[PDB]
Design a binder for this molecule. Structure first.
Ligand SMILES: CCCCCCCCCCCCCCCCCC(=O)OC[C@H](COP(=O)(O)OCCN)OC(=O)CCCCCCCCCCCCCCCCC
Ligand SMILES: Nc1nc2c(ncn2[C@H]2C[C@H](O)[C@@H](COP(=O)(O)OP(=O)(O)OP(=O)(O)O)O2)c(=O)[nH]1
Lengths: 97, 93, 54, 48, 368, 167, 341, 48, 117, 167, 100
C-alpha cells in the first residue's frame, strides 16, 4: 500500500504542476468566446420587439451582484449559436461519441 | 416553457400511472404494479431535482429505501390475503 | 306509563334504521364484531414422480 | 376599554407581524449554518 | 396423560405455578415471565360425556385423582342464587312472580312446560362456558391438566333435545343455536374426549337408583328425551370433536374400569401427533412461539370480562326472554337491597365486612 | 369568459353578467354531475353518461338564467335595486325548479327560499360586508412561540446583526 | 397495547414517524415521517386473528400509499417552480399538496375510504386511527394556506359528516361520521389560527379517547347492544352516557369549552356565514346522539333475561370513568386553562 | 307550520341519509377515481 | 456508456439472428397432439399444475430485500473513507455491522428458518 | 439521438404498460421500464453510480417479488398480438425520425454532467462519488442512515407479523 | 424552509437533511436570503426579500436565464423559416472545446 500511495501521490504532485497552465490557456478562450457570443446575441436579434442583450426585455437576470460582475453563462447559453457536432464534442466525452 | 420541455415527460407518465391505478383489474396485482411504475416515475422527478443540487443528490437512497418498503408491505398484505381467503380477488370486495 | 318496548327497540336494529330495498335485504350483524375465520381446503400440488426419473 | 385596545394592537401586530410574538413565525438558519460548518470541516480535511 | 402408577409416585410441576387465582396478568408481565416454561406432558383437557345419570362425577374425580388433574365439579345452577354469604335468592318468594322467580333443574324436571325454563337453558350454557374458561385459566397458569365432566360444546345436545320434546320455543332454539357461534368460536377444543354409552333403559335403571324427589318422581324422563341424548351424542356432538379431539368410547362408567381407561389413554400419545402443523387434529393447540403462548395466556388470565361480555346479545324478539320493565326494576330492587348484595363482595360491611375505610383492593375477574 | 356579475350596475351588460353567473352555475352543475354519475345512475355508455350530465347541468342553467333575467328585468323596468328585486328573482328560479322537477309544490317553496338567498346576497352587496372575508388575524402560537425550541446542535454565531451600521 | 408485545413496538415506531412530520423542516422530511407512520400502523390495523381487519388493511394502505405518492410529487413541483419550500404565493403548485393531505386525514370530499375502514377496525385500533393518524396531515395543512379549498372542505365537512351519521346503525360507522363532522371544526379552526386548533384537537382527542375506550370495555358494537347492555342500576347507564352529549358540547358537558373557543376566534375573523353552517349541522350531530341516548335517559326499559351480572377490566374501567367525571364537571376549571390568551 | 319545518325536515333528512349510504355502498375504485380527477384538473390548470 | 449500449444492441441482434437461423436450419415435423404436452415422467399431467403460492419463498426474498438495501447503504464506504471525518465514519459504519450481527444472532435464537412448515 | 430516443422508448413502453393486462406482461413491462429509466437518469447525472444502485435494489431484488407472486400465470400463457407490436414499431419510428428532426440542443436537458462542468472547477477532479456521498456519513446528517437501517429492521418485524397469519 | 411548529429535538435529524448552501454558487444567494428570513421572520421576510428571492431562484432555477436562451434560439430558427438564414449562415462558429 505504501507503493500504491507513493505513485498516486506522484500523479497528484505532477498533477498540480500542470494545472495552472491549462487554466491560463483556458481563460483567454473564455473571454475571447464571450466577446463573440455577445456580438452574435446583438447581431441576431437586430429586429426584435424590445430585446436587451444579456437580459430579458429590460430587467437584469441578476441584480444583487454589483456592477462589472461576470457570471459565467450556463453551458447551453455558451453554446447558444452552435451545432450538435460542437455540443456533443464536449458533452458526450464521458460517453465517447 | 421550462416545464413543458423538461418536466413534461415525467408528468405525462405520472398521470398515466394513476389512471391505470384506478382502472379495472381482476385482482389488485395490476394496481400494485401500477403504483410501482409510478414510483419509478416518482424517482424520475425526484432525481432531476436532486440533480439541480450539487450534493443533495444522495437523497435518492432515502426515497428508494422508503419506496421498496411500501412495495414489500404491499405484497405482504396481499399474500397474507390469498392465504386467508384462499384468494385476494377483487370479487371478494 | 310507556316504556321503551320491543317495538321501540325494533325501530333500530337493521343495518340501517330506515331500512331500504338493499340494506333491509342483506344483514350482517355479528354481535361480537369478531367473526372467526372458517378454515378452507388448501389442495396441494401433485407430482407423478417417476417412472421416467433417475 | 383595555380589551378594545388589545384587539386593535393585535390587529396591527398581525397585519405587519413586526414583533416576535403570537403573530410571528420564527425561521431558522441554524441548520444551514451547521451544514456550512460541515462543509468547512471537510474541505480542509480533503486529501491524504 | 401418564398415570402416577407408571410414575411410581407423584408428578411434579416443572416450574413454580403462577398465582392466577389472586394475581392479574399483564402484557408487561408476559414480557417479564414466560408461559410454556411451566407446560409439561399433562397440559391438556380431557372432556367427559355420557347419557344423563351416568354417575361420571365419581369417575372423573378418580380419573383426575390417579392421573393428577383437576376435577372441576359439574354445573351448579345455584351459583346464580348464591352470594358472598351463601343464601339462596330462591329464598326470595314469588314477590315478582312472572319472570323473576327462580328456576332450577328441580323446576325443570318438575315441569318443563314453563317458558321461564328457557332462562337456565341458556344460562346453563353460560355456566358451562364460564367453567371452561376457568379450566383454560388453570391450564395455562399452572400447566396442570384438567378434566371437565361436561362442556359447552356438548350443551347443545340437551338444547336440541329439549326443543325436540317441544319444551323450548322455536324462537329460543334459534337464539341459542345462533348465539353459540358467537362465543363457542372463542374456546379451544379439548385434547381428548371420553364418551360413555349406556342405553336409555339402562340409564333409567340407574336414575331410578338416584332416588331424587325432584327427578326420580318427575315426568320429563321419557325414552324419547333420554334417547335424544344418544343420537345427538352419537353423531351430532361427537363428529366435530372426533375431528379435533381424540375420541375414546368404552361401554360406560360402571363397567368402565378406571385402570384400563388409565392405560388406554396413556397408550394414546400425542408426540405421534407432533407431525405436520397444518393437520386439523389438535389444531387449536399448535402454539408456534412463547409469545403466542402468552397471547393465549393473557387472553384468558386478563380477558375473562371480555369473554363474558360476548354474551351481550340483543334479542327483544322473544317474549319469554324479555322482562317486564317495572317488574324487572323491582327485581333489581330486591337483589341489590337483599342481604349481602349492596356493594362489591368484601365491601358488604352491612353483612359483616371489616377492614374498610382503607381497603381498596379487588380480585382478578372478581365477579362484578 | 372572465367577467364579474356584481362589478357592474345592476342593470347593464346582461350578456357579460349572465356569463359571470353561468360560470359559477356550470361549476356546480358539472361538479355534482361527476359526483353522482359514479354513485347512483352509473349508466353504462357515453351517450347515457352524456344524458345524466345533461340532465344535471341544464336545470342549474335554468335556475341561474331565470334568476338573472327576472331581476335584470326588474331594474330595467322597475327602475330600482331592492331586496324585493332579488326576491322575485328567487321566485322565478324556483318556478323553473318546479317546472323541471315536475313537482309544483317543491318548486314554489324553493322559489321562496331562493328569494331569501338573493335577499341576503343583496344585503352583503349593499352593506359593505361579505360572507367569507379574508382574515384580519392569523395567529401562530402563544407568546413564547419563539421560545419553544428544544434542539441540541450548537449554532455558531450569525452573519447578520440587528445593530446599526458602523461605516 | 391490545394483545401482544409487538403492539408497543409498532406504536413507538409510529410515534417517531409522525413526530418527524410535525417537526419536519422540509416537505421531503415530512413525507419521510408520513411513510414511517404508514409502516408502523398497518400491522396494528391488520390483525391476523380475524378477516375484517385484513380488508381494511388493503384499503388503508392502497389509499395512504397513493396519498404519500402524490404528496411528495406535488412537493417537488412546488419546490421546483418556486425553488424554495415557502412559495411566495399559493398557486396550482400547492392545491395538490392539500388534496393529498386532505385524503390522508380523511376530509370532506375524500372520505369514502374512511367509513369502509371502520367495519374492519376494532375499537382501540379505530380510536388510534381516529386521534393520532390525523395529527400529521392536519399540522401540514397548517403550512398550506389556500383559503378556498379549506373552505369547501369545511362546508362539506359537516353536511355528509352528519347526514351519514343519521343513517348508520353500526357504532363503527357512526364514529367515522361523528369525527368527519368534528374534523370540519378543526379545519376551519386551523384556517383561522393554530393555537386554538391545537387546543380543540386535544379536547377532541380526550373526548373521543374516553368514548371509544368504554365501547372497547363493554364491547358494545350496535345500537341494539347499547339498549341491551346490562347495568345493575340503570342509573350509571345514564350518568356514563352524558358524554354522548359532551360530543355536541352543550355547556354543562365540557365539550362546549373547545367549540366556544373556536367560535369566538372564528367570528373575530368575521367568517360569520361559515359559523352558521357548521353550527347548523352541529345540531344534526347532536341529533343522532340523542338517538343513541334513548337507551339511558329514560330508565327501566325492556331487557334480555339471561344476563345477571356485568363485568369489565379494572384498569380500563378505573381510567375510563375518571375521564368521564371530567366530561361531566369540566367547565368550573375555566381558570385552570391559561392557553387561550 | 310543522310541515314547513317540524317532521318534514326529518323526512327529507332520511331521504338524504339513504342517498349518502348509496354513495358509500360502492367500491374503492370509484372514490380514488374522484381524487385522481381532482388531481388531473389541478395539474392541467397549472399548465393553462 | 453508449459505446456499451451499442455493443449490447449489436450482440443481442447477433444473438437473435443466430437463434432465428437455427429455427430455419432445424427440420420441421407435423405437429402432434401429444408431442406438446408437459413432461411428467410419461404419465398424464394432473389438473392445472399451477403451484400453490402458500409458501415462504417470498419471505426469504423479503429477507433478501432488507439485506439487499442494507448492502446499498454500505457500498459507498469505500470511497468516502478517504474524505469523511474518521470518528463519524468509524463509529457510524461499525454500528451498521454490529446491528446486523445482533439482528442475525438474535434471529438464530428465534431460528425462523426452522419453520414447523 | 440517445436522450430523446430514450424518451421515445419510454413513451412507447408506457403505452404498452397501460394496455397489457396479463400480470406477467405488466411485470415484464416494468422490467424494460427500469432499464430505460436507469439509462436516462444516468445521462443527466454526474455519473451512473445511482443508476447501478437502484438497478440492483429496485430491479435486481425487488421486482423478483412482483414477478414471483404474480406467477399466478393466469393459468395460461400469453396470446401475443403482433398488432400492438407493429403499432409499437410504427409509433416508435416516426417518433424516432422526429427525434432526428427535433432541435439538437434545446430538446436536451440542462443538467451538468461531470463533462459539462467547467474546467476550472477544482472540486470536479476528485473521485466522482466521493464528494456526492460525503454527507450521507459525515455528521450531522448521517443519523438518518441509522434511521434507514432500523426502519428496515422494523420492516422485517412487520413482515413476520403480517406474513405469519397462522401459517 | 417552512418552520416546524414544535421544534423538538427530532427536527435535529431532518433540518439539515439536504442543504442548498454547501458547495453551490446558489448557496451564496441562499445565505444572502436566509439571513434576512431570520431577521424578518417568515412572513415579513417573504415580503421584503424581493431581490434576494429573485436571484436565489434565478441561480438554481435558471428560469429567466434559460428561457432567454430558448427564445433566443427559436428566433434563430424563425428567421431560417422565413429563409433569411441559408445553409451556411444558419449556425455560428463552434466554441473551442477547451472553453467553458
Ligand atoms: C441445410 C441443412 C438442412 C437441415 C434441415 C432439413 O432437414 O431440411 C430438410 C429439407 C429437405 O429434406 P426432406 O424433408 O427430406 O424433403 C422435403 C420433405 N417434404 O431441406 C430442404 O428442403 C432445402 C435444402 C436446400 C439445399
Ligand atoms: N335443561 C338441561 N338440563 C341438564 C343439562 N345437563 C344436565 N342437565 C340436568 C339433567 C339432570 O337431571 C341433571 C343432572 O343429573 P346427572 O345425571 O348429571 O347426575 P350424575 O349421575 O351424572 O352425576 P353429576 O350430575 O355429575 O353429579 O341436570 C342441560 O344441558 N340442559
Amino acid at each position: 500500500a505504501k507503493k500504491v500511495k507513493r505513485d498516486e501521490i506522484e500523479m497528484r504532485s505532477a498533477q498540480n504542476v500542470i494545472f495552472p497552465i491549462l487554466v491560463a490557456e483556458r481563460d483567454r478562450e473564455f473571454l475571447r468566446q464571450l466577446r463573440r457570443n455577445r456580438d452574435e446575441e446583438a447581431e441576431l436579434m437586430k429586429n426584435v420587439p424590445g430585446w436587451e442583450v444579456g437580459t430579458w426585455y429590460g430587467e437584469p437576470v441578476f441584480k444583487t451582484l454589483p456592477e462589472d460582475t461576470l457570471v459565467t453563462p450556463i453551458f447551453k447559453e455558451f453554446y447558444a449559436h452552435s451545432d450538435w457536432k460542437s455540443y456533443a464534442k464536449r458533452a458526450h466525452l464521458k460517453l465517447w461519441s | 416553457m421550462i416545464m413543458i420541455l423538461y418536466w413534461s415527460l415525467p408528468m405525462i407518465l405520472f398521470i398515466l400511472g394513476l389512471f391505470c391505478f384506478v382502472s379495472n383489474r381482476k385482482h389488485l396485482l395490476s394496481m400494485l404494479l401500477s403504483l410501482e411504475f409510478i414510483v419509478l416515475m416518482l424517482f424520475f422527478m425526484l432525481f432531476i431535482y436532486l440533480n439541480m443540487l450539487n450534493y443533495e443528490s444522495y437523497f435518492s437512497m432515502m426515497f428508494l429505501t422508503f419506496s421498496v418498503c411500501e412495495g414489500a408491505l404491499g405484497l405482504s398484505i396481499l399474500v397474507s390475503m390469498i392465504r386467508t381467503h384462499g384468494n385476494d380477488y377483487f370479487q371478494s370486495f | 306509563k310507556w316504556y321503551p318496548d320491543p317495538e321501540f327497540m325494533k325501530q333500530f336494529s337493521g343495518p340501517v334504521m330506515y331500512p331500504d330495498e338493499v340494506t333491509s335485504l342483506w344483514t350482517v350483524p355479528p354481535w361480537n364484531s369478531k367473526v372467526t375465520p372458517v378454515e378452507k381446503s388448501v389442495r396441494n400440488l401433485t407430482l407423478n414422480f417417476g417412472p421416467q426419473h433417475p | 376599554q383595555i380589551r378594545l385596545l388589545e384587539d386593535e394592537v393585535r390587529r396591527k401586530m398581525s397585519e405587519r407581524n413586526d414583533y416576535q410574538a403570537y403573530y410571528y413565525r420564527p425561521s431558522v438558519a441554524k441548520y444551514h449554518r451547521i451544514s456550512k460548518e460541515a462543509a468547512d470541516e471537510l474541505e480542509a480535511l480533503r486529501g491524504d | 396423560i401418564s398415570g402416577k402408577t407408571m410414575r411410581g409416585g407423584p408428578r411434579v410441576p416443572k416450574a413454580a405455578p403462577y398465582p392466577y387465582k389472586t394475581k392479574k396478568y399483564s402484557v408487561f408481565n408476559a414480557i417479564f415471565d414466560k408461559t410454556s416454561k411451566r407446560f409439561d406432558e399433562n397440559s391438556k383437557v380431557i372432556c367427559v360425556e355420557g347419557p344423563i345419570a351416568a354417575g361420571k362425577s365419581k369417575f372423573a374425580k378418580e380419573l383426575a385423582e390417579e392421573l393428577d388433574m383437576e376435577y372441576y365439579p359439574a354445573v351448579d345452577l345455584d351459583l346464580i342464587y348464591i352470594n358472598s354469604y351463601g343464601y339462596d335468592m330462591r329464598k326470595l318468594d314469588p314477590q315478582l312472580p312472572p319472570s323473576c322467580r327462580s328456576y332450577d333443574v328441580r323446576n325443570f324436571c318438575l315441569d318443563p312446560s314453563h317458558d321461564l325454563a328457557a332462562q337456565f337453558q341458556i344460562r346453563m350454557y353460560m355456566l358451562r362456558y364460564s367453567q371452561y374458561i376457568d379450566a383454560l385459566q388453570h391450564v395455562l397458569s399452572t400447566g396442570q391438566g384438567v378434566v371437565l365432566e361436561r362442556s359447552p360444546y356438548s350443551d347443545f345436545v340437551f338444547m336440541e333435545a329439549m326443543f325436540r320434546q317441544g319444551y323450548l320455543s322455536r324462537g329460543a332454539r334459534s337464539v341459542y343455536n345462533e348465539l353459540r357461534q358467537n362465543t363457542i368460536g372463542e374456546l379451544l377444543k379439548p385434547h381428548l374426549v371420553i364418551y360413555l354409552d349406556l342405553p336409555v333403559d339402562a340409564v333409567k335403571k340407574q336414575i331410578k337408583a338416584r332416588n331424587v324427589d325432584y327427578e326420580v318422581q318427575s315426568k320429563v324422563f321419557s325414552d324419547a328425551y333420554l334417547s335424544d341424548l344418544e343420537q345427538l351424542y352419537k353423531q351430532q356432538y361427537l363428529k366435530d370433536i372426533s375431528t379435533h379431539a381424540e375420541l375414546l368410547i368404552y361401554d360406560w362408567t360402571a363397567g368402565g374400569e378406571t385402570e384400563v381407561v388409565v392405560e388406554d389413554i396413556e397408550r394414546i400419545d400425542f408426540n405421534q401427533f407432533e407431525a405436520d402443523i397444518h393437520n386439523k387434529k389438535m389444531l387449536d393447540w399448535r402454539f408456534p412461539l412463547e409469545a403466542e403462548w402468552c397471547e393465549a395466556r393473557i387472553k384468558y388470565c386478563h380477558e375473562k370480562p371480555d369473554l363474558m361480555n360476548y354474551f351481550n346479545v340483543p334479542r327483544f324478539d322473544v317474549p319469554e326472554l324479555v322482562r317486564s320493565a317495572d317488574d324487572g326494576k323491582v327485581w333489581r330492587d330486591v337483589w341489590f337491597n337483599a342481604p349481602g348484595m349492596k356493594y362489591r363482595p368484601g365491601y358488604n360491611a352491612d353483612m359483616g365486612d371489616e377492614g374498610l375505610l382503607t381497603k381498596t383492593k379487588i380480585g382478578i375477574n372478581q365477579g362484578i | 369568459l372572465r367577467s364579474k356579475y356584481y362589478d357592474h350596475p345592476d342593470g347593464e351588460d346582461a350578456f357579460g353578467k349572465i356569463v359571470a353567473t353561468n360560470k359559477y352555475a356550470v361549476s356546480a352543475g358539472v361538479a355534482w354531475s361527476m359526483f353522482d354519475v359514479l354513485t347512483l345512475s352509473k349508466p353504462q355508455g357515453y351517450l347515457p353518461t352524456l344524458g345524466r350530465f345533461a340532465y344535471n347541468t341544464g336545470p342549474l342553467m335554468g335556475m341561474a338564467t331565470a334568476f338573472t333575467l327576472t331581476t335584470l328585468v326588474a331594474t330595467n323596468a322597475r327602475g330600482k335595486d331592492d331586496k324585493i328585486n332579488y326576491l322575485i328573482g328567487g321566485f322565478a328560479a324556483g318556478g323553473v325548479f318546479g317546472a323541471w322537477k315536475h313537482n309544483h309544490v317543491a318548486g314554489l317553496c324553493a322559489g321562496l327560499f331562493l328569494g331569501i338567498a338573493g335577499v341576503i346576497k343583496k344585503m352583503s352587496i349593499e352593506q359593505g360586508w361579505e360572507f367569507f372575508p379574508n382574515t384580519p388575524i392569523k395567529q401562530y402560537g402563544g407568546l413564547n412561540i419563539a421560545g419553544n425550541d428544544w434542539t441540541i446542535m450548537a449554532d455558531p454565531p450569525k452573519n447578520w446583526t440587528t445593530e446599526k451600521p458602523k461605516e | 397495547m391490545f394483545n401482544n408485545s409487538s403492539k408497543i413496538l409498532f406504536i413507538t415506531i409510529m410515534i417517531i414517524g409522525t413526530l418527524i412530520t410535525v417537526t419536519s423542516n422540509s416537505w421531503l422530511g415530512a413525507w419521510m415521517g408520513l411513510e414511517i407512520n404508514l409502516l408502523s400502523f398497518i400491522p396494528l390495523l391488520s390483525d391476523n386473528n380475524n378477516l375484517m381487519s385484513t380488508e381494511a388493511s388493503l384499503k388503508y394502505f392502497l389509499t395512504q400509499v397513493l396519498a404519500s405518492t402524490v404528496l411528495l410529487f406535488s412537493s417537488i413541483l412546488l419546490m421546483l417552480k418556486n425553488n424554495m419550500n415557502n412559495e411566495i404565493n399559493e398557486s396550482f403548485t400547492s392545491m395538490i399538496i392539500m388534496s393529498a393531505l386532505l385524503l390522508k386525514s380523511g376530509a370532506a370530499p375524500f372520505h369514502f375510504w374512511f367509513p369502509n375502514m371502520m367495519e374492519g377496525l376494532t375499537w382501540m385500533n379505530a380510536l388510534m386511527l381516529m386521534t393520532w393518524q390525523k395529527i400529521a396531515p392536519l399540522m401540514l395543512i397548517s403550512y398550506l394556506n389556500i383559503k378556498y379549498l379549506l373552505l369547501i372542505s369545511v362546508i362539506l365537512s359537516v353536511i355528509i359528516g352528519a347526514i351519514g351519521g343519521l343513517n348508520q346503525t353500526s357504532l363503527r360507522k357512526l364514529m367515522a361520521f361523528s369525527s368527519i363532522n368534528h374534523l370540519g371544526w378543526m379545519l376551519s379552526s386551523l384556517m383561522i389560527s393554530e393555537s386554538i386548533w391545537l387546543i380543540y384537537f386535544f379536547f377532541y382527542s380526550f373526548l373521543s379517547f374516553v368514548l371509544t375506550f368504554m365501547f372497547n370495555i363493554f364491547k358494545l358494537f350496535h345500537l341494539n347492544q347499547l339498549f341491551s347492555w346490562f347495568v345493575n342500576s340503570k342509573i350509571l347507564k345514564f350518568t356514563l352516557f352524558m358524554n354522548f352529549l359532551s360530543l355536541g358540547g352543550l355547556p354543562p358537558f365540557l365539550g362546549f369549552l373547545p367549540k366556544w373557543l373556536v367560535i369566538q376566534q372564528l367570528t373575530l375573523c368575521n367568517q360569520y356565514f361559515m359559523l352558521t353552517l357548521m353550527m347548523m349541522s352541529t345540531l344534526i350531530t347532536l341529533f343522532f346522539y340523542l338517538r343513541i341516548c334513548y337507551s339511558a335517559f329514560m330508565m327501566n326499559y325492556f331487557e334480555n333475561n339471561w344476563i345477571m351480572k356485568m363485568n369489565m377490566n379494572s384498569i380500563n374501567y378505573n381510567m375510563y370513568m375518571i375521564m368521564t367525571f371530567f366530561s361531566i364537571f369540566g367547565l368550573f376549571l375555566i381558570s385552570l386553562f391559561y392557553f387561550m390568551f | 307550520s310543522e310541515y314547513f319545518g317540524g317532521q318534514h325536515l326529518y323526512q327529507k333528512l332520511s331521504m338524504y341519509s339513504k342517498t349518502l349510504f348509496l354513495m358509500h355502498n360502492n367500491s374503492l375504485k370509484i372514490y380514488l377515481l374522484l381524487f385522481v380527477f381532482w388531481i388531473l384538473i389541478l395539474l392541467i390548470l397549472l399548465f393553462l | 456508456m453508449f459505446s456499451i449500449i451499442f455493443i449490447a444492441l449489436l450482440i443481442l441482434l447477433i444473438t437473435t439472428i443466430v437463434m432465428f437461423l437455427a429455427s430455419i436450419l432445424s427440420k420441421k415435423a407435423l405437429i402432434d397432439r401429444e408431442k406438446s404436452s408437459p413432461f411428467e415422467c410419461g404419465f398424464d399431467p394432473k389438473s392445472s399444475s399451477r403451484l400453490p403460492f402458500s409458501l415462504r419463498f417470498f419471505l426469504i426474498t423479503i429477507i433478501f430485500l432488507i439485506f439487499d438495501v442494507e448492502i446499498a447503504l454500505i457500498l459507498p464506504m469505500i470511497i468516502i473513507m478517504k474524505y469523511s471525518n474518521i470518528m463519524i465514519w468509524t463509529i457510524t459504519s461499525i454500528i451498521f455491522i454490529l446491528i446486523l450481527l445482533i439482528g442475525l444472532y438474535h434471529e438464530w435464537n428465534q431460528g425462523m428458518l426452522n419453520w414447523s412448515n | 439521438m440517445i436522450q430523446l430516443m430514450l424518451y421515445s422508448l419510454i413513451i412507447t413502453t408506457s403505452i404498452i404498460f397501460l394496455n397489457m393486462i396479463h400480470p406477467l406482461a405488466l411485470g415484464l413491462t416494468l422490467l424494460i421500464q427500469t432499464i430505460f429509466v436507469c439509462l436516462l437518469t444516468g445521462l443527466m447525472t454526474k455519473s451512473f453510480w445511482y443508476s447501478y444502485i437502484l438497478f440492483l435494489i429496485f430491479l435486481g431484488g425487488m421486482l423478483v417479488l412482483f414477478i414471483y407472486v404474480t406467477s399466478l400465470a393466469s393459468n395460461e400463457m400469453f396470446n401475443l398480438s403482433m398488432k400492438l407490436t407493429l403499432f409499437s414499431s410504427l409509433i416508435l419510428i416516426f417518433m424516432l425520425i422526429l427525434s432526428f428532426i427535433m432541435d439538437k440542443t434545446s430538446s436536451s436537458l440542462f443538467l451538468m454532467n461531470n463533462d459539462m462542468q467547467s474546467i476550472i472547477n477544482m472540486n470536479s477532479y476528485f473521485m466522482e462519488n466521493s464528494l456526492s456521498l460525503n454527507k450521507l456519513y459525515n455528521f450531522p446528517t448521517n443519523f438518518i442512515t441509522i434511521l434507514l437501517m432500523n426502519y428496515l429492521l422494523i420492516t422485517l418485524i412487520v413482515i413476520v407479523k403480517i406474513t405469519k397469519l397462522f401459517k | 424552509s417552512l418552520t416546524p411548529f414544535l421544534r423538538l429535538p427530532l427536527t435535529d435529524l431532518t433540518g439539515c437533511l439536504i442543504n442548498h448552501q454547501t458547495y453551490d454558487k446558489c448557496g451564496k444567494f441562499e445565505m444572502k436570503m436566509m439571513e434576512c428570513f431570520e431577521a424578518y421572520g417568515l412572513e415579513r421576510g417573504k415580503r421584503e426579500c424581493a431581490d434576494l428571492i429573485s436571484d436565489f431562484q434565478e441561480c438554481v432555477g435558471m428560469q429567466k436565464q434559460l428561457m432567454r436562451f430558448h427564445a433566443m434560439r427559436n428566433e434563430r430558427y424563425k428567421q431560417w423559416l422565413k429563409g433569411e438564414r441559408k445553409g451556411q449562415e444558419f449556425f455560428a462558429d463552434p466554441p473551442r472545446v477547451d472553453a467553458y
